[PDB]
Amino acid sequence: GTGKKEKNRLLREGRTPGDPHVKGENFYRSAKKIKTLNILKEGKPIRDSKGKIVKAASFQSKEVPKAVIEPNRKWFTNTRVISQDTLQSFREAMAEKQKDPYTVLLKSNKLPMSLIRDGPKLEDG
C-alpha cells in the first residue's frame, strides 16, 4: 500500500502541503472535532510552582476592558418601520387565521403585534 503515517495519509487524501494542523489530528479526528473535544478538557489555569496563576483559564481573564460606546448616527434612527398597507394586510391575516393541528411553528416573524391583534372586548375594557 502507501503507509499508515500522517504524511502518507495527507498525500493520499490530497491535502495542500505546508498547511498548519491542530495538535492531535489523525484519521479519526478533524480540526473541528478536536476543538469540540478540547472544550471538555479546558477550564484549568496555568500556575507557577507556588500556585499563583500566570495564565487564567478560558473566559476567566480578570482583565478589565474599556467599556466605551462610540458616537454613531445609527443610534438615533428607526431600526424597524412598517407601512399602513402592510399593517392592514397583517390585520386581515390575523382575522382570517385558523388553527391546524398538523402544522407547527418553526420561526416566528418579528412583528408589532400590539398594532395587529384585535383589541380587548367591550365589557372587559
Partner: protein, 65 residues
C-alpha cells in the same frame, strides 16, 4: 462575568462550563442547548423580556418589550 460550573464525580472536577451572572436577553424561539454541549449557561431566572424605557423629549416612561 462568568463563574465556573464544576462537573464530575471525582474530587478533581472539570471546569469548562461558564454561568452568566448578569441579566440576559435570549430572544424569541429560544431552545437551550443540550447539556453535553452547553458551555455558556444563561439561567432562566435571570432572563428578561421587558424594560422601563423613558422618552427624554415626551417625559414619559413606558414598559416596552
Amino acid at each position: 462575568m462568568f463563574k465556573v460550573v464544576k462537573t464530575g464525580k471525582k474530587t478533581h472536577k472539570k471546569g469548562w462550563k461558564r454561568i452568566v451572572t448578569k441579566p440576559t436577553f435570549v430572544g424569541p424561539d429560544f431552545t437551550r442547548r443540550p447539556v453535553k454541549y452547553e458551555r455558556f449557561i444563561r439561567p432562566m431566572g435571570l432572563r428578561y423580556k421587558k424594560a422601563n424605557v423613558t422618552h427624554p423629549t415626551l417625559n414619559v416612561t413606558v414598559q416596552l418589550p
